[PDB]
mmCIF file of all heavy atoms in Angstrom:
data_model
loop_
_atom_site.group_PDB
_atom_site.id
_atom_site.type_symbol
_atom_site.label_atom_id
_atom_site.label_comp_id
_atom_site.label_asym_id
_atom_site.label_seq_id
_atom_site.Cartn_x
_atom_site.Cartn_y
_atom_site.Cartn_z
ATOM 1 N N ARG A 38 113.386 122.218 78.285
ATOM 2 C CA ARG A 38 114.508 122.670 77.459
ATOM 3 C C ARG A 38 114.103 122.695 75.995
ATOM 4 O O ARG A 38 114.569 123.544 75.231
ATOM 5 C CB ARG A 38 115.722 121.746 77.611
ATOM 6 C CG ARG A 38 116.392 121.739 78.950
ATOM 7 C CD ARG A 38 117.412 120.594 79.058
ATOM 8 N NE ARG A 38 118.085 120.593 80.325
ATOM 9 C CZ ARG A 38 118.803 119.584 80.794
ATOM 10 N NH1 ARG A 38 118.853 118.411 80.156
ATOM 11 N NH2 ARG A 38 119.454 119.723 81.951
ATOM 12 N N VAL A 39 113.312 121.723 75.591
ATOM 13 C CA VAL A 39 112.862 121.617 74.205
ATOM 14 C C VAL A 39 111.510 122.273 74.023
ATOM 15 O O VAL A 39 111.308 122.945 73.030
ATOM 16 C CB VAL A 39 112.948 120.156 73.682
ATOM 17 C CG1 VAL A 39 112.267 119.185 74.487
ATOM 18 C CG2 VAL A 39 112.458 120.059 72.285
ATOM 19 N N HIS A 40 110.583 122.107 74.951
ATOM 20 C CA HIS A 40 109.208 122.502 74.716
ATOM 21 C C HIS A 40 108.825 123.810 75.381
ATOM 22 O O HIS A 40 107.712 124.296 75.150
ATOM 23 C CB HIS A 40 108.277 121.387 75.194
ATOM 24 C CG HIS A 40 108.504 120.100 74.492
ATOM 25 N ND1 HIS A 40 108.150 119.911 73.178
ATOM 26 C CD2 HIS A 40 109.129 118.975 74.883
ATOM 27 C CE1 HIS A 40 108.525 118.694 72.811
ATOM 28 N NE2 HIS A 40 109.117 118.099 73.834
ATOM 29 N N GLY A 41 109.680 124.390 76.202
ATOM 30 C CA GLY A 41 109.307 125.612 76.901
ATOM 31 C C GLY A 41 108.994 126.759 75.953
ATOM 32 O O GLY A 41 108.110 127.572 76.228
ATOM 33 N N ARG A 42 109.687 126.868 74.834
ATOM 34 C CA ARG A 42 109.436 127.954 73.901
ATOM 35 C C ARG A 42 108.139 127.773 73.111
ATOM 36 O O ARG A 42 107.739 128.702 72.403
ATOM 37 C CB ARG A 42 110.601 128.111 72.932
ATOM 38 C CG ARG A 42 110.781 126.890 72.005
ATOM 39 C CD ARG A 42 111.846 127.115 70.918
ATOM 40 N NE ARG A 42 113.108 127.518 71.533
ATOM 41 C CZ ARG A 42 114.233 127.778 70.877
ATOM 42 N NH1 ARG A 42 114.293 127.664 69.560
ATOM 43 N NH2 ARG A 42 115.312 128.124 71.561
ATOM 44 N N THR A 43 107.470 126.644 73.196
ATOM 45 C CA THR A 43 106.236 126.420 72.474
ATOM 46 C C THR A 43 105.044 126.366 73.398
ATOM 47 O O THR A 43 103.935 126.045 72.956
ATOM 48 C CB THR A 43 106.266 125.180 71.617
ATOM 49 O OG1 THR A 43 106.479 124.059 72.482
ATOM 50 C CG2 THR A 43 107.348 125.310 70.503
ATOM 51 N N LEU A 44 105.232 126.740 74.660
ATOM 52 C CA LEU A 44 104.173 126.761 75.642
ATOM 53 C C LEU A 44 104.129 128.145 76.287
ATOM 54 O O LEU A 44 105.159 128.796 76.464
ATOM 55 C CB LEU A 44 104.455 125.711 76.722
ATOM 56 C CG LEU A 44 104.373 124.280 76.222
ATOM 57 C CD1 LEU A 44 104.913 123.366 77.312
ATOM 58 C CD2 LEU A 44 102.986 123.880 75.780
ATOM 59 N N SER A 45 102.932 128.605 76.624
ATOM 60 C CA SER A 45 102.780 129.867 77.322
ATOM 61 C C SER A 45 103.141 129.717 78.797
ATOM 62 O O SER A 45 103.168 128.630 79.332
ATOM 63 C CB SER A 45 101.329 130.335 77.216
ATOM 64 O OG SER A 45 100.542 129.453 77.995
ATOM 65 N N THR A 46 103.348 130.862 79.468
ATOM 66 C CA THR A 46 103.648 130.813 80.912
ATOM 67 C C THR A 46 102.566 130.089 81.679
ATOM 68 O O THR A 46 102.848 129.307 82.577
ATOM 69 C CB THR A 46 103.811 132.195 81.583
ATOM 70 O OG1 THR A 46 102.524 132.904 81.755
ATOM 71 C CG2 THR A 46 104.823 133.065 80.881
ATOM 72 N N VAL A 47 101.316 130.296 81.318
ATOM 73 C CA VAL A 47 100.234 129.661 82.069
ATOM 74 C C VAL A 47 100.142 128.191 81.771
ATOM 75 O O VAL A 47 99.757 127.405 82.651
ATOM 76 C CB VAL A 47 98.875 130.401 81.916
ATOM 77 C CG1 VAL A 47 98.971 131.816 82.493
ATOM 78 C CG2 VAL A 47 98.350 130.406 80.522
ATOM 79 N N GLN A 48 100.536 127.754 80.580
ATOM 80 C CA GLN A 48 100.637 126.313 80.319
ATOM 81 C C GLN A 48 101.781 125.681 81.117
ATOM 82 O O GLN A 48 101.626 124.579 81.634
ATOM 83 C CB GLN A 48 100.837 126.064 78.819
ATOM 84 C CG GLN A 48 99.598 126.286 77.991
ATOM 85 C CD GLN A 48 99.837 126.143 76.540
ATOM 86 O OE1 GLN A 48 100.791 126.676 75.992
ATOM 87 N NE2 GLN A 48 98.995 125.344 75.906
ATOM 88 N N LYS A 49 102.931 126.358 81.196
ATOM 89 C CA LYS A 49 104.055 125.810 81.960
ATOM 90 C C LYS A 49 103.714 125.709 83.420
ATOM 91 O O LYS A 49 103.999 124.699 84.061
ATOM 92 C CB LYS A 49 105.319 126.630 81.702
ATOM 93 C CG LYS A 49 105.767 126.434 80.219
ATOM 94 C CD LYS A 49 106.958 127.231 79.798
ATOM 95 C CE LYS A 49 106.619 128.634 79.491
ATOM 96 N NZ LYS A 49 107.694 129.279 78.621
ATOM 97 N N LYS A 50 103.061 126.731 83.985
ATOM 98 C CA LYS A 50 102.626 126.660 85.365
ATOM 99 C C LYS A 50 101.611 125.561 85.556
ATOM 100 O O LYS A 50 101.628 124.875 86.579
ATOM 101 C CB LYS A 50 102.093 128.010 85.835
ATOM 102 C CG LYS A 50 103.170 129.071 85.884
ATOM 103 C CD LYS A 50 102.629 130.469 86.121
ATOM 104 C CE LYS A 50 103.691 131.539 86.013
ATOM 105 N NZ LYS A 50 104.698 131.409 87.101
ATOM 106 N N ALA A 51 100.717 125.358 84.612
ATOM 107 C CA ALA A 51 99.774 124.253 84.707
ATOM 108 C C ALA A 51 100.487 122.911 84.746
ATOM 109 O O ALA A 51 100.041 122.005 85.447
ATOM 110 C CB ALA A 51 98.774 124.290 83.583
#
Side-chain angles (χ1 to χ4, degrees):
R38 293 169 179 166
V39 54
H40 300 289
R42 65 173 54 179
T43 61
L44 293 170
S45 69
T46 73
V47 297
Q48 286 176 313
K49 293 177 281 200
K50 294 170 187 294

